[PDB]
Automatic annotation (TrEMBL), chain D:
Keywords: Capsid protein, Disulfide bond, Host nucleus, Host-virus interaction, Late protein, T=7 icosahedral capsid protein, Viral attachment to host cell, Viral penetration into host cytoplasm, Virion, Virus endocytosis by host, Virus entry into host cell. It comes from Human polyomavirus 7. GO terms for molecular function: structural molecule activity. GO terms for biological process: endocytosis involved in viral entry into host cell; virion attachment to host cell. GO terms for cellular component: host cell nucleus; T=7 icosahedral viral capsid. This is VP1. The chain holds residues 24 to 288 of 379 of the full protein. The keyword Disulfide bond applies.
Automatic annotation (TrEMBL), chain E:
One of its GO terms (cellular component) is host cell nucleus. It is found in: Host nucleus; Virion. GO terms for molecular function: structural molecule activity. It comes from Human polyomavirus 7. The chain holds residues 24 to 287 of 379 of the full protein. This is VP1.
Amino acid sequence: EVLDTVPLTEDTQYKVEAVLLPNFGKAATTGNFQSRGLPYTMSDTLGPGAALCYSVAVINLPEIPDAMCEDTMIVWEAYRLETELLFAPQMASSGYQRANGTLAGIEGTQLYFWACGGGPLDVIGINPDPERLKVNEALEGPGNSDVASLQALRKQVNAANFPVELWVADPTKNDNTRYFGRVVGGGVTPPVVSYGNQSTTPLIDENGVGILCTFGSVYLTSADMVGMTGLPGLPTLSADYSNQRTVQAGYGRFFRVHCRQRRIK
Amino acid sequence: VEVLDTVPLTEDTQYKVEAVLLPNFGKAATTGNFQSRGLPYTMSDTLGPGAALCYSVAVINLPEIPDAMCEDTMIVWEAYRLETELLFAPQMASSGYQRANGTLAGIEGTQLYFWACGGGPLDVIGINPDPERLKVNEALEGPGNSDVASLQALRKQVNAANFPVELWVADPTKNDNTRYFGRVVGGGVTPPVVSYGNQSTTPLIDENGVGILCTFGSVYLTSADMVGMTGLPGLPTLSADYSNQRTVQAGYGRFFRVHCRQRRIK
Amino acid sequence: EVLDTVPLTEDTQYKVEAVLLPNFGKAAFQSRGLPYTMSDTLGPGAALCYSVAVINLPEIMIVWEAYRLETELLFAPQMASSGYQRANGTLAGIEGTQLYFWACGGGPLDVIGINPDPERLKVNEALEGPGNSDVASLQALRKQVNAANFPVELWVADPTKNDNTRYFGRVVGGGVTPPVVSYGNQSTTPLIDENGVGILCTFGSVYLTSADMVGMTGLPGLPTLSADYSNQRTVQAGYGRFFRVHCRQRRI
Amino acid sequence: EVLDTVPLTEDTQYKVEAVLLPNFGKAATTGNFQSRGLPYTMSDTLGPGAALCYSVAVINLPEIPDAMCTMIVWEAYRLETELLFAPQMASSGYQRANGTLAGIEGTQLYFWACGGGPLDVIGINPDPERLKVNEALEGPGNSDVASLQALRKQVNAANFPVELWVADPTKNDNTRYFGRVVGGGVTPPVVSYGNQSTTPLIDENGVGILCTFGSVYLTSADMVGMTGLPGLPTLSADYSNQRTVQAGYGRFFRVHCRQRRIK
Amino acid sequence: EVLDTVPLTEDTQYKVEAVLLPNFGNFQSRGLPYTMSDTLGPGAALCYSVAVINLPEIVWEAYRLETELLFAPQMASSGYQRANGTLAGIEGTQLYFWACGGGPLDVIGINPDPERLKVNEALEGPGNSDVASLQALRKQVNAANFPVELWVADPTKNDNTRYFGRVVGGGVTPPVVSYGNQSTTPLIDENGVGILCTFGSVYLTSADMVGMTGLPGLPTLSADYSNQRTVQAGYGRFFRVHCRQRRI
């Protein structure tokens, strides 16, 4: 039961910024912050350090004095955010394609994903080919379903080792989270990344209600796979160099989250 | 049917329901074949069951409305808005590698993204794009022999799991109590672009403010999401010798949330 | 001189539907043509022509005014139907040059005839010949699409006329370009001008014209996109183009 | 000083239509109206008849009786413009390697302008040392950058190549223009057209193009890409000496004028 | 503390124009050959362009701007590709960037491969981080030698600068450039406040890499000619900045 916002003052408003760093997770409890992974390989197995995992940040919010009074409590409500991907054009850094006599640049399959909620992101585990695709056991294994059935494995992203190839935001949950993702397929598809500091993203639902941070924190999740790359000053996009193809992630993803106070029953 | 006023909004006169429609490479009418990759599609002239993507359907029962009938009027659920999202992840090791470009192959090729929401099954037109040369296995719903959407082309409703999306098109001359949208992309190496999120919404109301009238007590959902084709994990693809392994890649599922209110009709 | 609309009743409003079928016109319906060839010559049966419908409206100076339409392209993904490309070890699909065009007017569509290469491009006698201009000059041939044999490669909607028609077209070039087709039953298209006046159907009918070339295709289950099979490439059209035209009464 | 519009009557409003034809200029005073050029060549030199030049039209407007008191002038406040073009199939040759029609592809430019005088342009040679320009065409001088020293002219003739002359954003105070460039050698073109779109020409103060010289000046260029010849191979080295620029068939303009008082 | 705008007159409003020229830190629209090496070299790598425009002697508040890229189609200028029997044109990786602020642009230095990507000493080195951590080098673009491959607008700062960038990857990607003199860009924040020019100047920054190119009339997009591939920049980026007065 959501009631009214507390009248706006300096004390009833709070904003916070964070930069989520790319994470080729190798462990649950600690991230591996690097914007390029280990070589991905042309194998049937996702390897730790090679596969891009979700990035997460949990940001504690200030205590609200006299929060509980009568049957109502006051909580922080995140009602708007700005987010931006940090990235530069890749030239000398990404190797050369002999067949086209030029720089290879970044290309291939992509994912651009962000979420903001009052708890960790609900996800579904899907193995696109449960018989043939293998997942190193240091990464969160998605179970045996290739479809998003009631039986598919469900978890929350509370750790550094959830590969983006295996875990999808769960639309049947995430009732107190907003999220947005874009996937691009193909192996040579060019990426297009835009950024700036004038755009903003509202977080309010149809009733004017944002994310209710009833656990005292705001939870951020992201993943930004820009494509694949070769190594600087070496050939790529040729059979002999497939063993060096590497995932290129964004340099980081900036968030600015705006909060106000909201009374709930 | 004359549409009267909405019933005043309360907790009891509004209802929302969720479903996830799973991909189906139909092999039979009454039982779906829920998998997100088919059997190898083949380079042949014949659509085979398990290989060809079929429409997914769900029929979702809505709550009984007590005391709904008065003389010449009744109260029914009206679906006025929906959210729908495709579930999908980037495909990397799962989709093989292309030697010629020394990199992962990923998903590419011909695509279809389709959804429908209505008060009964989706009306479709059967079209064979080449009636003389394109063959269809008898386990699948055969579209008949028209290559054009003439008055004579076969018409059916999608009431089973074995209607291939390659052979059956939403019928714009019918579907007066269904809303639908589809997007087709051609080519054999075309990259897919899929987006999803839980903030977008789709109104279902017509120019008179009237949504889908779920007069039979259920809402009918239909979908198809072919993201492209794929090779097998860790193996070479996009080369002549491995064409017999190319497989259709479907979405993992299609989410719907349907919002309903009550409407009196006369 | 256009005056006021007639007050709205059940009798002063009319809507009609039609599905125009693809036409590879041979003289003045199939969704794939005869093989197109790599040659310098457009053939009847190979080249896509405009589709036309003249739809009679009810007897009622008051005339019917079309103020809004819905239009949708009917099409399915092409997989086994379009053959395979050995070089990429996968299905070929539909690709290449495209045209998506519709018009709605109170008479036939005004067009300009253009031969893009008057010295070298040849046109079979069964098709409506565009004359000898490669530019939309005053001298370029002007006709109306009142028959089934106007090839879309040779006739372009005339923006100096069509004062009582609305039209829209999109051309995509290239030979391997992927097509993108969308359709649904919720979109709609107003037909009214700056002064609130739609199409005035002064002959007692509404005139529809369309062309939907989605690209080229090989034959089912056979190799394509290679030299040996170049003589088998065929134009893929849409299966049909749906129109719903909404009319009211207008005093002239 | 711009004052008020004249109260709208039949006499205080005027609209005019034109179709600007493609021009592969070979001389200054006379256009060369064709929608395909001579073969462009794979050379370091822009050839006359091969390089697309800007198309221009200057349209005289009606005399306004008792215009001076302040003076009344025609103000162009809105226009419609559309490209005339058809799909190119048999006309554009075949790509042997892919066993299909080549169609139109490659580098593109779609440009229009409408103003009260000729378009102001900057001359830029993208490689002053190595790119050569036939002497029948307006040479852009020796700057590869849009500096204060770059050659400046107006498009007052039929021989300004679009590869060498860019609309000048430091001038054109009484012109509106828009351009789109697409690179690459095999990029597919997308052209749309219709008779329902419109383009406003009014600025922040609601003032359009003031036609103080008694005419409206139209400028355009529509390079759709390159093409081979009908029934012949293309997109292969052996036939590269036949690759030709494909222009639009024409560009339609309808320009809407009203009367405006100025001081 | 931001107070009220000063009432509008002829005196309290000011606009200024500039064209920022491409800078391979210095003004040329094609660099030296870029090389297929592991090393960014001076004159081959595109750097940010900068202009500091002094304003007339309360501070000036830039509330609106127009910006456009100057560029022409590249045909004979960009070489020929034998494999497709036609002109190569411009293609490849791209950046289109502009910024307008009351001081220099705040940037973060990032080396995308600290172990292998090398940077010539004449260019501003980004330090050793491949991620935008608190540890990543932080600088302002106040010189002509900041490579756009190494320095990214800092979203954690730039509180008095507006910026926008677009990056396109790949080695053969076609560029699409649009321009015109009717579009405009507001610079005001949610409170109606623009760029406060508290040093009495407006600071402009830009980068426009349209792709790569071969030399005129010569083969390109083939191995033997890779040592001739060169970055193609825009011919210039125009700005018109609109200013009013604001009590501070």
